[model samples]
Target: MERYESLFAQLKERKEGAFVPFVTLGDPGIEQSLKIIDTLIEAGADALELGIPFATLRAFAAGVTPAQCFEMLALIRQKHPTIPIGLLMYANLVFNKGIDEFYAQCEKVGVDSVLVADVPVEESAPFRQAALRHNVAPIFICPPNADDDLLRQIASYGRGYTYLLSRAGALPLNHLVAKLKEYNAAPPLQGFGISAPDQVKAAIDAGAAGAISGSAIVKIIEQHINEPEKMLAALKVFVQPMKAATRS
Candidate 1:
């Protein structure tokens, strides 16, 4: 779907960058997880990147499946038709379910993009093709130390946005940002340890499209798992200023 097309266009028009938040689909429980999703959307998240729940037993032993995750996505699609929603997962999940099936379900549930965290550009042909077939953009990660050749490859194969990993410990942020621009890649969205509002603004200043905050937001939930109201209230306080930083 061209969901990202509209969302990014709007962001550009407003002279604003995106603020994406990542969370697990079945964190705590499916119902509670949906509440968290709702809270983020209400807090002005520009887009969303969600992964399958990490606790295999917590999700599966309780009878939750990938299908359950898809259902939650469908609920989200019904609630927010235009917001960009992306899936962040590993290659094995894609292959084990069969690439075609994986992407088809994504498109069916109105997912805007998919990022296979463990897949490199060298082996992304099949996954990228399947995503294109279903109108689902295949996102690629740009390592902090990516070379020109690797950058070019990611520029060619990646759609939606490029995930600029911050794992290389304080990268030459500005230089690397400009390097990605030279390759004409999709908007570079910095992730990995992006928590504070200053960091969000720093990413925008460095020519990034936006930044994704995962652990910081997820930690709020972890701290208030038993008190859903407090968790959402904390999220509102935490996300408001971070979103404000997106202004150009």
Candidate 2:
């Protein structure tokens, strides 16, 4: 929580928005994943949203276990103590391990926050309580079409920052962003379909505190899976412009 607070404060002071990148843990393998994470940090990612292997069909085929994800988090934390790290996973992961134990592991590994994608605010009480007890911020998502009532609940339950879904073909987010602010929600980080620098700038222009991009970075990894050097180089090239776009 302190890390996120400090990060937002620093970005505000610099008159810049944040550029967070997302990646699945142990995508190509642990060693390669570490390199990928380092590349993102070097390319100026303000924070990280990491996904752990869950019950998805793809995950069943080949995915890192929860234990391995914790190991990666611990390693990253040891190397970069102050960088904010948030886990983006499903509710089952938390429930399977027991809510309190899951959050306790997060706290031990220095994870700053967790966003359970499948858990809506209505079902968030136990998860949120565990997270808060273990000093982990519980993040919530705000859909573009969310009503004022939902926005109010999100504002009350959210911490660190809200994940603002920027759906393709959806209306511009100016109104939604304004409403979130009016409700005093955590700063929204617009995500989904954010693959380029212009999109990053547009999110900030729409009143987002930042943007989060996932598939764009993952695509680079997929294209160069066998070529580590190429993958790392391409990641740096890909993320720098987006980070620069955060400047107002």
Candidate 3:
């Protein structure tokens, strides 16, 4: 919580938006993934939104297991003490372990927040309770299509930041962003299909605190799977300009 709040304040003072990059932990392999994260931080990532590899409906077959995810988190926390780290994963992972135990481990490892992608706000009580109890923020998603009432609830319950979805089928984000602000929601970080500098600029312009990009970074990893040096160099190239675009 202090990490996120301090980061936001620092960025705000600099008149810059956050450029958070997302990746599947243990995605090519654990060692390579650590190098990828090092590249991101060195290249000026403002924060990280990492997904634990789980075999969900999505094609994330090569991800690390839950235990490995915790190990990675511990390592990342040890090395990058102040960078805010958030976990994005399915609820079953939490349920499989007890909810309290899962969040407790997150707290122990210094994870700033957790976003259970499949858990809607209506079904979020247990997760939320456990998270707050363990000092891990429970992040919530606010789709572009959310209504005023839903926005209010999200604002009331969400902490750290809101995950605002950016998709073609949804309405424009301007109004939704405004509504979230009106309700005093956690600052929103626009995500999904946000692969370019222009998209990051547009999201900040639309009142987001920052932008979170995943697939584009993952694609880079996929393209350079066997070439570690090339992969790190390419990620550095991909991240610099995107982070630069965050400046006002």
Candidate 4:
């Protein structure tokens, strides 16, 4: 039972930042997925994000589909048991599976934390309660369109990290780093649309615990699954910048 509050405390010292890569669970299957987790953590990933599966391709504004999200999650559990795992999913997945049952399953799999994408603050009460019951920190996500009130609400109840979207679209890098700064603070990891290692570094500079690089890493996996060397090298390059930025 590791508490991420401790992780946040150590990170706050500014001794080098964290580059959290979000991967769709079960992508290309879990065996390949765990290897990626190990590689990222070894490459200095302070934390890892598991994008839970769903079906929102035609429904969502952008294209981070849910079809492959779940498989990646299940596989991660079976492999790479070392790194901290965070579930990035939606309410439908939880509700469909039954919140209590889902929480128990996550607890059994040793999931450290979770964040449901579309779970609004007003609707997050029961889910958060259930997660707490299972000792799984319920990470809260706030979008760009979210106003100050919403920001404060999430902050008041947030744990591990308060995830925020950089823009109104899928994860981007260059521009997102600049906009995500306003939300950076204790226990809050400014993210969303954060897709580059430089952005990871930049966000840390702005006081974020870390930047969640989802699409960027997913793209890397899609392009270089067979080339571990190249993929790892690229991952290292991205992580290096954040290390420099977060370090005092």
Q: Whose lDDT is greatest here?
A: 2
RMSD of each: 2.3, 2.6, 3.0, 6.2
Tens-digit lDDT track of model 2 for 208-248: 99999999999999999999999999999999999999996
Candidate 4 is scored at a TM of 0.76
Per-prediction count of colliding residue pairs? 0, 0, 0, 12
Off by over 4 Å in 3: 55-63
Which residue pairs come into collision in candidate 1? none
Candidate-wise lDDT, in order: 0.87, 0.91, 0.90, 0.67
TM-score for candidate 3, please give it. 0.95
Q: On residues 1-248, what C-alpha lDDT tens digit does candidate 4 reach at each position?
A: 46466666566675756667777766655567667676777777777877766555664754334434444555655665555678887788888879988887788777788888777787788888888899888887766566567666676666666675666444333333344345542255666677655666666666556667777777877787788768767766766665455566
Better of 1 and 4 by lDDT: 1
Q: How far is 212's C-alpha from truth in model 3 (Å)?
A: 0.6
Candidate 4's displacement at residue 99, Å, is 0.8
Model 4 / residue 69 / CA error / Å: 8.8
- Model 1 has an lDDT value of 0.87
What's the lDDT for residue 106 in model 3? 96
TM per candidate comes to: 0.93, 0.95, 0.95, 0.76
**lDDT value for candidate 3?**
0.90
lDDT at residue 163 of model 1 (Cα atoms): 90
